[PDB]
Design a protein around this ligand. Structure first.
Ligand code: FV7
Ligand code: GNP
Ligand code: CL
Ligand code: CL
Ligand code: CL
Ligand code: MG
Lengths: 166, 469, 167
């Protein structure tokens, strides 16, 4: 069993925790309880290989913004999450991308761009805009809903595949 | 250079690391042993987070620190003194200018705020995942509510207000799937006719499914509080480990039910049909990764009353002997193949709990509570880490739900199963062994014939599922 | 090459039974243990000049899985029947353990030893004479052990292997 260290990052309230808990427990969290730092484990077979995912769920609130280096050092791959009804969260993505690159001293860190809350009709970030950004980063873009489960496995397991081939 | 710290005389958590207060294992450090002060310092360290350590600590600390004392210590941790103005600040102030306060600002940003936030994370995890401390001590809960409810200052405000709400929620206290569950399967017994439910009349697929849902729920209900301190083995086990015991007693009852079904079927041909049906249920248990269920069956087939039934063994189809053999091999060599299989499958699954129990107990019994170093007694934390690694593995398999539909009547049937009736264990297991001797006597006594007891067809419908539109 | 003996430890839970095998198999001189470690229950020993391998099954903690007892016992060639000298009930349980072992092995003559275990400083309630009398009534050896000092531990296991060899 190969162990994979995944880290979920992005602005406050975009659904990092809901995505993670949907993956781990098949449950949608309706409450908004801001995270400090949470970790989860999941045994799962991906492309016929059994592995063990360690998932770090991080704080998006700005008050925690000086405490990120320590978790970025440990992560092997990163889910960079924004919400498709929150343009500010999309604009915050590049800051996470740049910090990760700095801390890991690499232009080649496994990442997936995730556009969450795709169950909501009132979109403010268009898919094309996010896809263009993803291409500029050399990474896939996956739209998700923590509420309905759409895309959730695809997002996490695509990140595993990128770590695996790194 | 490094930030200066408060004086260790006004803030205990600033004492320097030494071998008299902390020992590390041979990229964050792993603690072998330490004083409780040092454990709490590292639990809430300014340089890094350690979410695994938080779980390990909160799961196991009661073996070295009382809950009331833990709360006192983390409140003490939280209350960090700010440093005085520096020489450059002094000079600015004397000139009527605003000081830069560079050192103060750095200390707030890089020591106080991370440590305070990490104390709050301990509180958050404590309340969310170890709330039993507060259920059992109302005064402890009051103290936590009061501490959280009086934290001032905007840096922590979001989390303080959140933790307050989480506490209030916990005081007064839904699954989504990638697919639809398969259709419930029926055999001789039809929906609503609970009076006819039995081993051979329910569909073997649905027997395995409903037992798996039941056993999964029982497995998922067991909390670490029922395990740490080996409390399920001690005199107050019924108080401290009720969900664990309910789970074990279910397993025991099902095994005995299988044995009873077999030896109370005196007709050889009918008894062969009973055993074959049980091995089909085992096959579906295997397909569902219900290892508890697999071992319930294997335990029955290896029991004294059943094991000796050579005439019955002789008529079991070769393919079913192979299935039973493979299941039996899981347990061989101290569960070597079981452990490997568990670690290879795709959950959901239902682990066999017994191995965990033995490993927790032996870890507890085989390691000292303290290490003596330089005249000091240090808490042996590596022992606690080992116990929490086991509880962590247990919890990891508790997350994934089965995509199977409950059948309320079949569920009730197996919940109410009581093969021993009002009999005590020894009298019942003697009864089963005597039945075994009756239906297949020891050589050279001749093998008797017995009349059939079932009036319905014995042919199995098989264990491959059907699917109408 | 060398003979392997499959030994099974049985007895009441909650009274220090696991200390026997832990103290034996342990790094005798470092009080430490990881039971999860493959072969933390296998030990090569020399008994009466003859080298052999002990494979010890101790399912301590699983006592409530009462219907698995047959399954576990069936694996054994020799048995240590353990009670705590400060727990009379555990001593009274011995008769039924022995009867169950005889049934599972389908033999009236199964290699076994009676072990009286001192697991703490609480008052002894089973005197050595009572236990000796019981062991004699069964025709088996009696060994007392300490769960703290390792006294008696080697004697209990070696005596059992001698019972197997002399069967
Ligand atoms: C009534 C009855 C009792 C037994 C009890 N028993 C037996 N018997 C062999 C014949 N003499 C008595 C023991 N073999 C097994 C095996 C096994 C191991 C290796 C290879 C093949 C097998 Cl099948 C596994 C298990 Cl868990 C139980 C076994 C088995 C069956 C199938 C029965 F119908
Ligand atoms: N409709 C919808 N709501 C969602 C979705 N994901 C999260 N939410 C909601 O958005 C809110 C914030 O979710 P949360 O997971 O806590 O976000 P977060 O990014 O972890 N926040 P933080 O950074 O502070 O820890 C919650 O009310 C949650 O129910 C989604 O996919 N769809
Ligand atoms: Cl988890
Ligand atoms: Cl010798
Ligand atoms: Cl007593
Ligand atoms: Mg969150």
């Amino acid at each position: 069993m190969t162990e994979y260290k995944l880290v979920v990052v992005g602005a406050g309230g975009v659904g990092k925790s809901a995505l993670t808990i949907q993956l781990i427990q098949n449950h949608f969290v309706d409450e908004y309880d801001p995270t400090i730092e949470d970790s989860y484990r999941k045994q799962v077979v991906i492309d016929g290989e059994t592995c063990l995912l360690d998932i770090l769920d991080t704080a998006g609130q700005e008050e925690a913004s000086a405490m990120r280096d320590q978790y970025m050092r440990t992560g092997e791959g990163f889910l960079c999450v924004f919400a498709i009804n929150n343009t500010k969260s999309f604009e915050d993505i590049h800051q996470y991308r740049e910090q990760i690159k700095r801390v890991k001293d690499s232009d080649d860190v496994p990442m997936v761009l995730v556009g969450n809350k795709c169950d909501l009709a009132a979109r403010t970030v268009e898919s094309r805009q996010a896809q263009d950004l993803a291409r500029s980063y050399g990474i896939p873009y996956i739209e998700t809903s923590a509420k309905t489960r759409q895309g959730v496995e695809d997002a996490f397991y695509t990140l595993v595949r990128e770590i695996r081939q790194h | 250079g490094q930030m200066r710290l408060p004086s260790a005389d006004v803030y205990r958590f600033a004492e320097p690391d030494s071998e008299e207060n902390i020992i590390f294992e041979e990229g964050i450090p792993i603690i072998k042993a330490g004083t409780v002060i040092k454990l709490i310092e590292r639990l809430t360290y300014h340089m890094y987070a350690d979410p695994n350590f938080v779980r390990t600590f909160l799961t196991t600390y009661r073996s070295f620190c009382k809950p009331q004392e833990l709360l006192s210590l983390i409140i003490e941790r939280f209350e960090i003194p700010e440093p005085e103005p520096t020489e450059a600040d002094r000079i600015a102030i004397e000139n009527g200018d605003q000081p830069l306060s560079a050192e103060l600002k750095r200390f707030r940003k890089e020591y106080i705020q991370p440590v305070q936030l990490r104390v709050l994370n301990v509180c958050r995890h404590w309340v969310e995942h170890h709330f039993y401390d507060f259920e059992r001590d109302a005064y402890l809960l009051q103290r936590m509510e009061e501490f959280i409810g009086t934290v001032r200052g905007k840096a922590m405000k979001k989390w303080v207000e959140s933790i307050t709400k989480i506490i209030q929620r916990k005081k007064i206290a839904n699954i989504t799937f990638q697919s639809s569950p398969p259709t419930v399967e029926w055999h001789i017994s039809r929906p609503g006719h609970i009076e006819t439910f039995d081993l051979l009349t329910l569909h073997p697929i649905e027997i395995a499914r409903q037992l798996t849902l039941l056993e999964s729920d029982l497995y998922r209900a067991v909390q670490p509080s029922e395990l740490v301190g080996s409390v399920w083995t001690k005199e107050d086990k019924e108080i401290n480990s009720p969900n664990l015991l309910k789970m074990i007693r279910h397993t025991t009852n099902l095994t005995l039910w299988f044995e009873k079904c077999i030896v109370e079927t005196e007709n050889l041909e009918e008894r062969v049909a009973v055993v074959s049906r049980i091995i089909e249920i085992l096959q579906v248990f295997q397909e569902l990764n219900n290892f508890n269920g697999v071992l319930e069956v294997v335990s029955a087939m290896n029991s004294s009353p059943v094991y000796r039934l050579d005439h019955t063994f002789e008529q079991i189809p070769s393919r079913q002997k192979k299935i039973l053999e493979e299941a039996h091999e899981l347990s061989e060599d101290h569960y070597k193949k079981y452990l490997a299989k568990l670690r290879s499958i795709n959950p959901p699954c239902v682990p066999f709990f017994g191995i965990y129990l033995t490993n927790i107990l032996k870890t507890e019994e085989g390691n000292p509570e303290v290490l003596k170093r330089h005249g000091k007694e240090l808490i042996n934390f590596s022992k606690r880490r080992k116990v929490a690694e086991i509880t962590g593995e247990i919890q990891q398999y508790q997350n994934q739900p089965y995509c199977l539909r409950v059948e309320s009547d079949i569920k009730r049937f197996f919940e109410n199963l009581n093969p021993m009736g009002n009999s005590m264990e020894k009298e019942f297991t003697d009864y089963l062994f005597n039945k075994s001797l009756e239906i297949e006597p020891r050589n050279p006594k001749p093998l008797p014939r017995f009349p059939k007891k079932y009036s319905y067809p014995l042919k199995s419908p098989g264990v491959r599922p059907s699917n109408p539109r």
